[PDB]
């Protein structure tokens, strides 16, 4: 058996709720004492009887805080995980430097007092919205032992990610005007690894700012890849394997059925 499985079998229902089975707490990590990020806030489960759980990073875009993905945490934690959200040094870093920021937040868990004996250092994964996602994609291409990293209306200079050997789930919204998929998530997924396993979700008719509220489409995906990869829970491939059928998604293609 699979000793990274947590909480109940999965359906449609349970990964779009906005709480999963799991009560969470939250701990907050000041600017002073965050070294390499702006401080976060993180979101964890409560309850430790089934084992530790694995991290994940998420940051926002440009002239956005952490309260522009607050709502990422609690709803992802809540099923599993320890999320930290984060703010950025300053509020105009652009994507290579979110990415550092995203794998300092991922160092500072390891020793924080709270979570210490909550997470598993060995199972860790990056998001982000817009240069967030942008980020999320050079932390990958920075460290090949990252399980998961998704790019939510990423945006980036760099079209070539070539390099990176994470399972990606690459999110766009269709009528993006300012991280058109054209020339950013979908360039993203095409020069990601043909082989790798990975996905890209278009949301129809989303504009650029759909993941800074609740939006049920990328929340449920989300927690699928990160049940399906992080924790290498394979009762969570029926809901990316195969295309999708939500109204909500206009385009989808993937490397299904995953390694
Ligand atoms: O004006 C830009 O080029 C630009 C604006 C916002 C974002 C973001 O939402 O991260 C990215 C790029």
Redesign the pocket.
Known sequence: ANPYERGPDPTESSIEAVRGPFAVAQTTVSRLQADGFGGGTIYYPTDTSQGTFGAVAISP????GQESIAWLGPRIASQGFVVITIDTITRLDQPDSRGRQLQAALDHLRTNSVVRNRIDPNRMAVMG????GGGALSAAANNTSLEAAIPLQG?HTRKNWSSVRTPTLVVGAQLDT??PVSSHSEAFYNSLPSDLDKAYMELRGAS?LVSNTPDTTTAKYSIAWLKRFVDDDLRYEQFLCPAPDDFAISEYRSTCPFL
């Open positions: 875009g440009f002239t956005a919205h817009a240069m967030g945006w300012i991280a650029h």
